[PDB]
Amino acid sequence: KTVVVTTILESPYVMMKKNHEMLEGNERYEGYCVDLAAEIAKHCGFKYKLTIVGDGKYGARDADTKIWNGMVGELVYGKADIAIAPLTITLVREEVIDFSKPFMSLGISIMIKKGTPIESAEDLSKQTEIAYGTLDSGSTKEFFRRSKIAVFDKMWTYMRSAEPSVFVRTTAEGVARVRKSKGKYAYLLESTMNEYIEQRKPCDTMKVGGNLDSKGYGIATPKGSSLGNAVNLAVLKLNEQGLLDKLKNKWWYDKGEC
Amino acid sequence: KTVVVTTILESPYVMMKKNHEMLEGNERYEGYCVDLAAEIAKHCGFKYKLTIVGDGKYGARDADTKIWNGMVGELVYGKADIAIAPLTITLVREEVIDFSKPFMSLGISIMIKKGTPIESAEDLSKQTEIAYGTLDSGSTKEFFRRSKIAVFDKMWTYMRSAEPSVFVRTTAEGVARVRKSKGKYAYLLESTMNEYIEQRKPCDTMKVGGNLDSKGYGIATPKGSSLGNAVNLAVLKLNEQGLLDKLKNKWWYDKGECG
Ligand SMILES: O=C(O)C[C@@]12O[C@H]3C=CCN[C@H]3[C@@H]1C(=O)N[C@H]2C(=O)O
Ligand SMILES: [Cl-]
Numbered sequence: 001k002t003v004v005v006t007t008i009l010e011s012p013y014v015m016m017k018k019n020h021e022m023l024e025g026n027e028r029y030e031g032y033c034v035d036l037a038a039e040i041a042k043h044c045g046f047k048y049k050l051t052i053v054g055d056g057k058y059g060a061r062d063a064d065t066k067i068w069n070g071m072v073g074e075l076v077y078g079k080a081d082i083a084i085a086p087l088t089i090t091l092v093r094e095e096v097i098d099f100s101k102p103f104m105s106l107g108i109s110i111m112i113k114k115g116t117p118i119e120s121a122e123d124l125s126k127q128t129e130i131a132y133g134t135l136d137s138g139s140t141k142e143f144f145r146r147s148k149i150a151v152f153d154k155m156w157t158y159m160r161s162a163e164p165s166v167f168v169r170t171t172a173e174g175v176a177r178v179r180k181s182k183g184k185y186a187y188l189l190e191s192t193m194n195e196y197i198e199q200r201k202p203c204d205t206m207k208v209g210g211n212l213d214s215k216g217y218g219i220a221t222p223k224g225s226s227l228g229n230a231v232n233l234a235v236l237k238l239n240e241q242g243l244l245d246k247l248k249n250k251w252w253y254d255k256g257e258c
Numbered sequence: 259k260t261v262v263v264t265t266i267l268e269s270p271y272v273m274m275k276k277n278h279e280m281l282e283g284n285e286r287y288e289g290y291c292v293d294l295a296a297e298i299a300k301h302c303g304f305k306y307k308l309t310i311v312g313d314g315k316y317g318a319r320d321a322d323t324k325i326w327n328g329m330v331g332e333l334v335y336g337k338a339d340i341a342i343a344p345l346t347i348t349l350v351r352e353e354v355i356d357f358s359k360p361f362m363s364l365g366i367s368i369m370i371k372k373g374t375p376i377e378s379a380e381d382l383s384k385q386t387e388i389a390y391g392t393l394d395s396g397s398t399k400e401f402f403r404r405s406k407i408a409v410f411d412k413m414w415t416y417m418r419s420a421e422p423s424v425f426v427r428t429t430a431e432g433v434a435r436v437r438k439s440k441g442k443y444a445y446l447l448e449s450t451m452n453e454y455i456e457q458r459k460p461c462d463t464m465k466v467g468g469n470l471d472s473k474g475y476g477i478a479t480p481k482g483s484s485l486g487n488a489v490n491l492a493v494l495k496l497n498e499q500g501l502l503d504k505l506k507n508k509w510w511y512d513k514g515e516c517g
């Protein structure tokens with residue numbers, strides 16, 4: 001009867017509080033998705049325990065074994081009752097679990113080190129002097145790889161052919177690369193992460209240009225889960241009570257340095 | 259067995275081609291939702307008729323009679339199999355129909371006549387010289403009535419007590435009112451519509467400020483519909499192929515009359 005919530009350690013969505021070793025259970029964690037979890041539970045009348053996804057992954061099906069990892073795997077294989085994380089709503093996932101309507105929208109955007117003479121994807125496309133790239137594996141890369149749009153296609157062919165490599169293994173590396181490259185590298189990533197980092201010391205980065213695309217984060221439950229309907233309704237209510245906006249403002253701006 | 263699609267005549271989602279009495283059936287109509295409808299049927303493998311909703315409303319429940327009007331009413335009362343329209347996904351509607359994930363996202367924004375000295379809701383709230391309003395009902399009005407935000411609250415109180423009325427009955431009314439009030443009126447409306455009108459002649463309007471909130475339009479089916487799963491999957495596939503983006507670009511920008 002205690003609901004098992006699975007999530008993932010990703011700031012500012014879910015973080016381990018500074019004195020977590022002095023804290024018990026759910027109080028070890030803070031962040032946007034921790035509050036969201038609490039808000040969901042209140043409007044759904046259930047008790048819950050926060051767990052961190054065992055393998056540190058989101059949810060991907062291995063082409064060969066067909067096994068799901070991450071949070072999606074924890075739902076499908078019955079370790080968790082529900083996922084409350086920055087888990088993107090995608091077709092392959094929707095086919096094996098239920099999604100709430102998205103609690104947050106986002107898109108591909110450009111992170112620059114402040115000073116950089118770039119204001120848009122187009123700016124990036126027309127030049128090579130400032131290197132730019134994405135995570136070496138994931139949707140942003142595939143977006144570029146698959147786009148039929150001129151600008152985005154010129155960016156991809158550029159990125160694929162660039163030497164040395166413009167791809168990074170981790171988000172943290174991308175951001176470092178920006179910060180360390182003295183304004184000669186730009187990074188493509190979730191507008192949400194871009195916005196968050198903009199509010200981080202040493203305050204030396206900046207989101208520019210519009211979003212290139214659009215996707216959504218949703219709460220995830222097993223197909224036919226008794227929780228999903230209430231959970232989805234709770235998402236919509238929260239949005240209409242200004243609460244999701246308030247949460248975002250909280251973790252991004254009110255608690256922002258810079 | 260042909261799927262009955264309810265939808266609504268709202269530009270540029272669905273539009274009766276001016277020569278429509280020479281045309282017939284689905285081909286009488288064009289626009290973003292007509293294309294969207296076709297993509298969905300193709301991916302869901304079905305055949306459909308487009309039918310404009312008898313009352314021209316989106317979907318709201320009468321406070322008294324408890325009766326659902328509009329496209330929601332058509333789905334809830336079993337008069338249509340699916341609604342493919344700029345139908346905002348909302349709690350009360352979600353409780354009575356099935357929605358797909360959003361095929362398009364939007365938020366409340368500010369339409370001004372070019373040259374109007376207003377850049378934000380904050381700006382609007384801090385003055386009265388320029389009047390500003392919303393549709394006399396719906397998602398946008400409700401947002402202001404309910405807001406706990408100081409700026410939005412002040413705007414609601416102003417709007418509610420403003421004379422003459424700052425509320426308009428229809429989008430066209432609100433657009434015309436902005437267009438003719440010599441920059442003495444700004445309309446608060448869906449960013450999607452704001453963005454479309456921006457690309458229409460006389461090209462005398464402008465969207466300004468950030469969105470005030472976030473919402474999505476979804477495709478609705480009657481609760482429990484066998485169609486709901488497949489359709490929702492299609493929205494995601496279309497979105498991942500970049501197809502939804504291609505369409506919005508098509509009807510908003512490719513076809514823009516303002517350069
Ligand atoms: O990057 C991906 O392909 C997926 C995502 O992986 C994250 C990790 C690094 C950069 N991107 C984000 C993306 C996000 O916002 N949610 C994840 C997810 O939805 O699994
Ligand atoms: Cl965003």
Ligand SMILES: [Cl-]
Pocket residue numbers: 170171172
């Ligand atoms: Cl990462």
Ligand SMILES: [Cl-]
Pocket residue numbers: 363364365449450
């Ligand atoms: Cl928008």
Ligand SMILES: [Cl-]
Pocket residue numbers: 394395396399400
């Ligand atoms: Cl109302």
